[PDB]
Assembly symmetry: D3
Homo-oligomer: 232 residues x 6
């Protein structure tokens, strides 16, 4: 029993899929997993454990932003023995070579947050995903014939940014998508010795101002298939 | 009809009480407000509008941390006409003069976050509450025989901090309670020209290590906040 | 008998009013206090102790800027037993809603200085006044028919700023007045466990370019009446 | 005809292998490339162009440290059309999970330098390698029976650090090796739109005092270069 | 007529000697200069203009700390045509090879202040004195057989530092003296195209805890002699 | 017998002249020193020891950029007993008061690097030269009729800067020339208790687009080296 998660050790699988919205975790448990049972509900942050093709897998919301996400993944790892975390969600694109509904994988995560600087003595910590998980997801996508873009995500602290000119810097530096928690997750996995990966689907084009459900399903199938591939 | 709040203009009152826990918002709606009706539920972030002594008041969770808190209160202010936000929650204490169950009001909020530096050209922005709201809350508590400590909160980005020696620094500088969203709310209030206040109840003593008594003290904090709304209206 | 103050313990009252200009301290001692006697003059920084309606009160200049102000109020607090400091001065306004001759109370104080970051491990320390002092001052003004603005001051390190565009940012965030020492006084009050308040009169409008003695006298009376309201 | 490189357009291939030491570049061009010709020598910074299994490949020294390697990689990309860069060097280990003689690939590069903060408005830029190059290098090592550690390198500005306690921080965060130029190469590659990769061989263990002989190190160095050149062919597809 | 200096263009010479204490400026005008006449007195910051060996020279206090000193030197330079500033004062020593009463010249000035970072886009500005002024002062000292140490001063923002371990860092990097304004003066001189120099006398040994009036006179004679040397 | 320098204690004099390019070290040792013998060549970074008017003097390249520079000066000081270092190079001018072919001395060195912040608890370290070396070089140039500009150099981390508006800032604050290693040499010299000086010749004007022939550049460079060597003898007295 932890402060933010009302479950017991053993309730979660060693791998957890994590959308930000708890209703998306409920949607995933009911439509993609077999026999999912709810294992937590504190603060309405629903978490479930079921199986995918016989493999035990959990799915749980993490809320919005770095701080919220860090609390949950930190507790999953140190209190529930979770080894691998796959964040799943929507992101905004800033570059011309990425179109809405494209599937991006964050090999790395840039950020404007100070959390990695507080852990790394104020130097530049490169928040990165676990290589084998990236590979697994790219192979799972290829198997279904889905193209994915692997690159840097940008984890913003402020959804309603006071500095919009930063989207032009992101673009020039190849940022593939903007979300709000990947840099925090990667930071937590490094601090606690676990492995993470963030997968996103472009829901909006910040620059050009540019189905959704179906593309969401492809993202989920890719993440879940990457879990089985990762076990081999 | 915003991305994070599925309500209509007019659904929220001009004043909103905001616990971090959506289930706390539900508890407040059911036990302290009259005829409260749910006005939003995207992402399970429950929001309700009811009445306190004839005065229309809203209550809604804001989730955990500065980024989450900023999204909700920003949308509330710019799309729902919200004028006053009172965050209500639990905090940890670092100072010996403050005990568990004490009620603290955050006249200012320190932080280890970068959000106010992004807004203020990397200079020191003093994230403060609206004075009249502090004053109303302090008078409301005084009328209920409750002693409140008014000072600086500290809004942490990392609940599981990699640097626990910071708690000794906070204590040395008078921090009255440690939580996670006050500096963000005050920063948003200053950016969008609204008014905000953070009231908290000490649920844990981070230094000394110190449900019923907490529930009771939680009810005390809610009553103060709601009574400050009426004193604030005069 | 300190390095910057040549007085003895007991020479100052427990409450000190501090204009930046030592000649302003002399003015206040002579026209608002009864039987004030000079208690210090090292570096020409005049300090006086007198009585306001029977209540012992001190007034002393603190010079210009954060470093100068910190030295004096630190010595007053640790060597002279000073419990409450009320800084009084003139300030520039950046906001359109604030006019010259308006009285502002600094509940908080922003700064481009590094002093609070040196004290607070490089994180954001919110330099704020003592709530009760703010409340007393606001009550005092209300009793004299004076409308005061309570909010954020900005304490600048450079009077001749190399970056005048900061004035638009301050305005955007509600800064009520720009001066040079409130963030340092509040930081010292927090470090040594004392109480402080900054009250100012808008002498110039930095944005619009926009009696002064009269409004200055108004600010002095509010400060002195706040001390008596604060004693109850 | 740039200031630091005295070659002409077309002298370099579109993929360039880069050790820090110009003599290692000479050694690679001589022993691993066919028909290598020296194409530049400004400041004794030797650059050659040869062929590997019929494919055109260049090898060039980049000096030590971020500032020196940025100058050369920037010139190769903007003046000579280079699209892919593979840095091949030596790094020190800080983690007990990594052993001397290990082959590490920098998927990312942490640093104590300010070069990426100057480029990215003082926010945190995750200095990363090109994913497909990491994958080609990882497959190539696997195909040669070499097990590679894929993770975060740390590019130090001061070889003789004034703060050794940072090594304990690097170990806790899983840094796989400490070197001096990856974070700078990754920043340049992102700024100019090219692709980069840093591969390293562990010559010393900072934390455990472990050393290796010059024989063993030559051999492990030899493995690294074969992986890199193989990865080029895999990457071409 | 400037806000902080009540004088007219022409009242100051092109070179100004500046102790922090205005009473020290008064002592210098009366004892070292011929026919010195007071030219300013706003805020009790006395300024005087007299003659040294027939050479017109001014002496004025600048108060304590960077912010205060910056206002005065900025106004002297841009409003009163001052070309050279020599700050004179007492400093604390942190290094074992520097004893009390030694005369140190700040060829450079380190600091914990943010003022040069605000001017220099957050990079490292090396606040340095004007080389010809350093040279003139070192030669003036040699003529009178006084030994001087030329090196880095450290300009502290906080007289009562919350971080005393910084004195050991200063010592290790060769800081010759700790004072509070040299880095600010050097910054202003650079920004406004003027020349500055800080000369100090060690009044206390911060480390070892270790006449004064006479060593003060040596410092002043050296500065004034450097002015004549500098004119050749 | 250090990692980057293949010499033995006593091979270097107590004073070392240091250009960035090792071929310039060769040129100086051959043309200005008597009986110069090469004493190291690790990574093609040539170091020599010769005599000037009977006074033992060494000359050695330091590569480009702070990090490379720091490694060599740090090794000369801690492993080989060097007491004084004079960096002799080329710089770009940003101020209209400085013309191409001018000789500038860096009494101080500004920088956009983080190496002195890492050493000085994140506060502002004024990276400064040794006063008596500045004075010896200034008198030596005066004695030769050369008028030197004494001031602040700016040591850039990125030669190909992503922020060129910074040059207008350096101009406003009087920077005398832009190079890449002075702030790092001064930091090392202060960390290890040694003395250093950076002298530079203006080969190009960044702000006005002024250039100079290779002939003019050789001659101005020739003047700089004689100033430096003369400053060593004056410094000994």
């Amino acid at each position: 029993a932890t402060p933010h998660i009302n479950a017991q050790m053993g309730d979660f699988a060693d791998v957890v899929l994590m959308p930000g919205d708890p209703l998306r975790a409920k949607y995933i448990a009911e439509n993609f997993l077999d026999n999912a049972v709810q294992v937590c509900d504190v603060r309405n942050m629903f978490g479930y454990t079921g199986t995918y093709k016989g493999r035990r897998i959990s799915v749980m919301g993490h809320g919005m932003g770095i701080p919220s996400c860090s609390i949950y993944v930190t507790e999953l790892i140190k209190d529930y023995g979770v080894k691998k975390i796959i964040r799943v969600g929507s992101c905004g694109a800033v570059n011309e070579g990425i179109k809405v509904r494209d599937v991006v994988i964050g090999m790395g995560a840039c950020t404007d947050s100070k959390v990695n600087r507080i852990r790394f003595k104020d130097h530049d910590f490169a928040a990165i995903a676990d290589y084998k998980m990236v590979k697994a997801a790219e192979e799972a996508a290829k198997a279904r014939g889905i193209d994915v873009k692997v690159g840097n995500l940008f984890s913003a602290e402020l959804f309603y940014t006071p500095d919009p000119s930063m989207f032009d810097v992101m673009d020039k530096y190849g940022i593939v998508g903007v979300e709000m928690e990947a840099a925090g997750i990667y930071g937590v996995a490094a601090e606690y010795g676990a492995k993470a990966l963030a997968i996103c689907t472009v829901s909006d084009h910040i620059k050009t101002g540019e189905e959704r459900q179906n593309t969401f399903n492809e993202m989920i199938e890719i993440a879940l298939d990457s879990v089985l591939i990762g076990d081999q």
